[PDB]
Amino acid sequence: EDPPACGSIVPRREWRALASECRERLTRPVRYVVVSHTAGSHCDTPASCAQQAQNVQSYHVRNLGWCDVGYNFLIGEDGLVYEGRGWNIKGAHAGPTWNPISIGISFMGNYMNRVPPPRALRAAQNLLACGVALGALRSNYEVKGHRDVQPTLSPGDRLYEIIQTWSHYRA
Amino acid sequence: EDPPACGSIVPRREWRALASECRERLTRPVRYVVVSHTAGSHCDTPASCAQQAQNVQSYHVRNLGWCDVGYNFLIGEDGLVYEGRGWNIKGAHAGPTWNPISIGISFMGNYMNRVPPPRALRAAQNLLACGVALGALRSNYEVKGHRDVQPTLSPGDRLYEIIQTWSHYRA
Amino acid sequence: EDPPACGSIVPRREWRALASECRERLTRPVRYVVVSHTAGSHCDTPASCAQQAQNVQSYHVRNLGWCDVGYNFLIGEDGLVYEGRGWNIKGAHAGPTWNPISIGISFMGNYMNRVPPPRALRAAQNLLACGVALGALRSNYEVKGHRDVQPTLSPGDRLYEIIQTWSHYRA
């Protein structure tokens, strides 16, 4: 029974989320990770990224009339991880086959032509390491890109390239 | 006031679609139309567009393991309409809420920072008139942008702007 | 918002209900509809159902000491909707995690082994459509069984099977 603090995660309170209204739950341990980009603009400061997180959830919540930001987590270019729906709540990020069986982490920006900075990559890698220590993810979890399970350009070409490389990436 | 009074459409046999395997049906008349873009490349001849439609199909069926190409109808900048799942089959284009109550029409190409040629826009408007003529769509149907319903950049800044002038666009 | 009135709801005064003492409001628009059964007697006439409404409220106020009938609405085999706590007041129908965030409509009877008549089902879905028309319910509202959010047989085997069938039903 180990309690670690791998959570260097910015809580929703800290980026000033609107109250989530989602109630459906994931079953631990989750087996799949789906990587996305927002396709939107990036941020490289804790301050600008809290704005970017609020903007993204605002779109999902107010325009799209959803129960919260779709992702389980957002990764920023400031090297920080933004608690989305977090580990226990079913996301809305890859459609009805994958949503119940996966975590959706998404990078804030458009990686069709940029590559994300090493510290975003590190954040993401670290987040996954956390999930495993927590029991949230299977230690042998698989990683898919967003375009691999759904018809989109997301996560972007350069990022898609990078994630194809990853240890836990699969087909 | 007699039968088939609408729509010039390239059938599946004609662009060499793989066999549809979709069973689920739409209940007509249909209220909503969701406008899309493929985000991929465009095509300006019957030759290349009949070619594009297969790519798209190929991707949705082979890579994603779907029963058929996700859209009900594809528009080409050749100025023709490629038959997707068609008027009667539930499509896969807008997630679980919009799919069973709408028709997904996808303009082949990426219209973030280019426009479809007048001929493409006519194909699609004409298709819509045709859908009313056949009682496949309600007379007072509503047009939505893909992004009004899913987090995506589709149908692209340029198209999105154009479709908002449409007689049938509702927010 | 928009004045056009809705549904054929039998008002409290009409079924001779005791006064409500409930004071808590529900934030509009509401996202969830929770469907339950009364597990009490059924009725099939406006006369016998007004009666039924009364015993259920009577049993809720007099015995359980709640402020009012626990449901937001009651449905008769009558084919009519009985006004319970209404659109605006928080119910007592699915526990504290689910009360503040949903409408509870209960069918009057025991549907483990009986099916409700078309008449009842129409009234129910109609009531929901008004919710939407009035802005009490989200356009994208979600219907859940009682069974899905608490450990109970409610709303009975047969009726549960029917609501699984509805457009707005969610896992």
Add this chain to the structure above:
Amino acid sequence: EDPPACGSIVPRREWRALASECRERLTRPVRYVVVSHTAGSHCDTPASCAQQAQNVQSYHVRNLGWCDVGYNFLIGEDGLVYEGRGWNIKGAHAGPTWNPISIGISFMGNYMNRVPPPRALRAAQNLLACGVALGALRSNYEVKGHRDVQPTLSPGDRLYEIIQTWSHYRA
């Protein structure tokens, strides 16, 4: 096989109606609503009211030799609405001047010495609201009583009084 009938209209098949052989259509949007009475027996349960709708249609078809029950809709004191000829098919309720420019709805009973229960009056207004939404009625529809248009004691003195207090009524 989609969402049902605003106003909880009882379908033809549900009250066991002889098949219609009417063909004249009604030009939507219709402006007028003539309100009549049956001048037959009333009914106050769904069981007795389906039986009554059945009786009056049988009289109209078998005896008078009409193509269907003369009314577009019938209202029971069970407080339900019985689909007659419906929104689209010209009625036979108010003679040649008025049949092609009217929905005619009839209360089942004789309202010379009786008033209909508020549930019937509610059912009737509800049916009208659902007329506009559908687009079968001009949003600014005008209501007349049967006797304002043909020489007759229908819809009965007691009911006629009520009708006059309605907002959309024009002497």
